[PDB]
Design a protein around this ligand. Structure first.
Ligand code: HEM
Ligand code: HEM
Ligand SMILES: CNCc1cc(F)c(F)c(-c2cc(C)cc(N)n2)c1
Ligand SMILES: CNCc1cc(F)c(F)c(-c2cc(C)cc(N)n2)c1
Ligand SMILES: C[C@H](O)[C@H](O)[C@H]1CNc2nc(N)[nH]c(=O)c2N1
Ligand SMILES: C[C@H](O)[C@H](O)[C@H]1CNc2nc(N)[nH]c(=O)c2N1
Ligand SMILES: [Zn+2]
Lengths: 413, 420
């Protein structure tokens, strides 16, 4: 069985063979499609043998050493551990191959043309929150690279019994605080209200300002998480100004420069890495459309259109649209001026289409999520809009996981 | 399964979907692979392409009559059981059956209601059905279409209408509108390599000139109708222009915009789909509503393979066009959709912007979950081609499934027509 996807802008057609090699579900059924559902739906020794065999097989295939003496020895070696220890350990090479392919298989990621240039920071020797703080700081300093961003992931000890998980309680490493006011308004980032509350509660002395960098909240080996303030000289920030509008700098906006996801789970060979913060660089619309303009978030459209003398009475004037465009010009122009790496939604999408042709050619497919790949503004004038994409889940994968405050049971009396 | 919840990540509203249990045919998806962005994911059809046997056709018929009498508080009534036997006899002697007039309107309004790709479904029960099953010629098809176009245009106060020609019989006597929409502009290939007019319609314009249409060869030449009746060679007809409402596009601020020289037509009328009810297939069924602004201004004007007027506009706006990062396409694309909306409203011609229309679809969604237990939706299609995340629907989970009666795709007839 093969499968064809079409680009209706170019008529190009690709043949996905790779979809045959996927295992866990997409959510969809034969008769219902869950392609827009955000979240649809500890392994024993016997569970873990075939998963590990799948990954070791895949690894030695990738390096044209399948069925070799070095392959068949490793297979025996992994079974020895799963028999003995009821788990096993990845070699360093495997953990780099695994982290890279988990990015490769991220169907919601438009930046995967860069996947093979991932810097893997092995942190599986870490034992304390202070250890995690150190590793993360060096990750940030490395990845930030004085505005010239580099992709990296730092991987902490895998799961054991689920009672001793390393976790980064932050959703991303660098995020701004939210505080809800007595009158009901929200200062800073309304998304991080709940997380700001935990921080404050644990010790944090908040500045109570509009762009406070949250502290890291870190859990090592299943113990109560611990607070740490990222040294400010390592948090690269960009103050947002518009090249046409002088008044724009007076909106007082900035953003962090380094997008670093820390709440997800890295699954390689049946092993789960519950704290695996990874990072790259930003696409313009992530800040300019979602962070700044979503009604749940910084929600600055009215403020901006007002300073634009826009008729904000009826919707058909497209004031919201007109203002959104200007704001993403601000974000790109601001980053570019402070020489902070960034990619606009056009450049990014054109790259992804090339990556996708490329991947269908050497790899035989590339699982994509149209609902996520298409930018959240100017959708149809980017090429991915006209690109049919097959969605399936390959492993290694990045996975969602419970929020650790809903699950953790506290030590401290 | 048992109940699937959908959720709106901007209001945390959750909706519980049971309507999907009554879904009859495949989506294209499997538990191991999602096809939600394939345009034609499936070829699962409820009956073979040609005249079907009794056990092939009756059960679909039994399915629809049963659902219709259910819809109107019967089921088991004398009129329902007499109907079931009437469809039995009628298939037992003509290999098809005929829909009562109540039955025909029910299915039509429900094919719209079930159309998961239509953001405009909140109006579904206010459809006007023109029964055209007594039709026998391309000339009759032209008369019926003409009245439709006049009723629906209503001097700019658009009304939704569908006109239903005779159901497919053995397949060789198909009725077909060969136009994709009733009113579309022409596409002319240029001797250099460029294109004049709407390049989506080049292959069609060719067939029309080839059939003897004398092309005026401009950028907004309304195309002729090519109408096929009872399997016979199709016939050209010019729609009288006093019936084709057109809006010249101007801009409320840029007075230079009127000189781009663009207009659009007011009546979106889809005429190439196949309406299916109780296993019957109405291969010709033009239907019309009113435009969402983006359709014209985002897709029609701004796709590369369409009119592609982006750079020509950005020039007049004097935009930084060296590199993408200046968002010059983004910037022009907004002015264009403001222009379109402003022109339609200034000519009192019905139109709906993307914000109003998407909000309404959220309300439709509630209405449907409250009374029906669900509402099938195609997120990929419902979200507008610009400014997605600032509209309500971008943040709303949607469940997609195939209910019958439905509107189906069908091959372009010239791929499958045996000319006379
Ligand atoms: C190098 C430049 C990168 C760019 C431009 C980029 C871009 C993006 C964007 C725009 C999204 C959508 C996220 C959202 O809107 O919430 C995304 C999702 C994602 N990216 Fe990338 N990314 C990059 C690097 C990486 C790296 C290094 C990894 C993994 C190590 C990664 C893995 C993912 C994953 C797993 C998702 C899905 C997020 C989710 O499902 O919530 N990306 N990416
Ligand atoms: C009354 C106002 C209406 C609005 C605002 C509206 C809006 C839309 C839009 C914007 C699309 C996507 C079109 C595209 O980009 O190709 C669509 C699709 C569709 N609409 Fe509606 N529509 C309306 C009326 C109707 C009516 C009267 C019918 C049938 C009686 C209908 C049936 C459909 C179908 C079947 C599709 C899918 C088209 C396809 O698959 O190619 N709509 N609608
Ligand atoms: C919870 N949604 C996931 C999510 C939220 C964000 F804010 C992000 F920034 C990214 C993201 C991640 C990477 C590695 C690069 C990039 N450009 N974006 C992903
Ligand atoms: C080929 N896809 C279908 C398609 C193409 C178009 F050009 C349209 F205009 C519409 C359409 C149809 C109706 C009834 C209302 C509306 N607002 N749009 C649909
Ligand atoms: C590949 C993708 O599914 C395809 O381009 C679809 C996406 N969604 C769409 N949505 C609408 N309304 N109209 C379209 O033509 C498309 N095209
Ligand atoms: C419900 C729907 O799946 C949800 O709104 C998704 C749509 N696509 C997205 N795409 C990106 N990149 N980010 C998002 O948060 C979302 N949200
Ligand atoms: Zn699906």
């Amino acid at each position: 069985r093969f499968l064809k996807v079409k680009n209706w802008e170019t008529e190009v057609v690709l043949t996905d063979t790779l979809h045959l090699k996927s295992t866990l579900e997409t959510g969809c059924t034969e008769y219902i499609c869950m392609g827009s559902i955000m979240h649809p739906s500890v392994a024993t020794k016997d569970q873990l043998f075939p998963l590990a065999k799948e990954f070791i097989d895949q690894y030695y295939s990738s390096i044209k050493r399948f069925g070799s003496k070095a392959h068949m020895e490793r297979l025996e070696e992994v079974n020895k551990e799963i028999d003995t220890t009821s788990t096993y350990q990845l070699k360093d090479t495997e953990l780099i191959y695994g982290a890279k392919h988990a990015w490769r298989n991220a169907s919601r990621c438009v930046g995967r043309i860069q996947w093979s240039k991932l810097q893997v920071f092995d942190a599986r020797d870490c034992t304390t929150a202070h250890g995690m703080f150190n590793y993360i700081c060096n990750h940030v300093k490395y990845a930030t690279n004085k505005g010239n961003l580099r992709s990296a992931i730092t991987i902490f000890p895998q799961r054991t019994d689920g009672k001793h998980d390393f976790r980064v309680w932050n959703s991303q490493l660098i995020r701004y605080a939210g505080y809800k006011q007595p009158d009901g308004s929200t200062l800073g980032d309304p998304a991080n209200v709940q997380f700001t509350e935990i921080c404050i509660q644990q010790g944090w002395k908040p500045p109570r300002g509009r762009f406070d960098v949250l502290p890291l909240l870190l859990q090592a080996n299943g113990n109560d998480p611990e607070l740490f303030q990222i040294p400010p000289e390592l948090v690269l920030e960009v103050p947002i100004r518009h090249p046409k509008f002088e008044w724009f700098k007076d909106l007082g906006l900035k953003w962090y420069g380094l997008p670093a996801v820390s709440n997800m789970l890295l699954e390689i060979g049946g092993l789960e890495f519950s704290a695996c913060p990874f990072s790259g660089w930003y696409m313009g619309t992530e800040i300019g459309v979602r962070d700044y303009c979503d009604n749940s978030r910084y929600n600055i459209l009215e403020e901006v259109a007002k300073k634009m003398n826009l008729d904000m009475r009826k919707t058909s004037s497209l004031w919201k649209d007109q203002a959104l465009v200007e704001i993403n010009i601000a974000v790109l122009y601001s980053f570019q001026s402070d020489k902070v790496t960034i990619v606009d939604h056009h450049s990014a999408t054109e790259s992804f289409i090339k990556h996708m042709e490329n991947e269908y050619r050497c790899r035989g497919g590339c699982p994509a999520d149209w609902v996520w790949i298409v930018p959240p503004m100017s959708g149809s004038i980017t090429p991915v809009f006209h690109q049919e994409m097959l969605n399936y889940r390959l492993t290694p994968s990045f996975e969602y996981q419970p929020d650790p405050w809903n699950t953790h049971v506290w030590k401290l009396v």
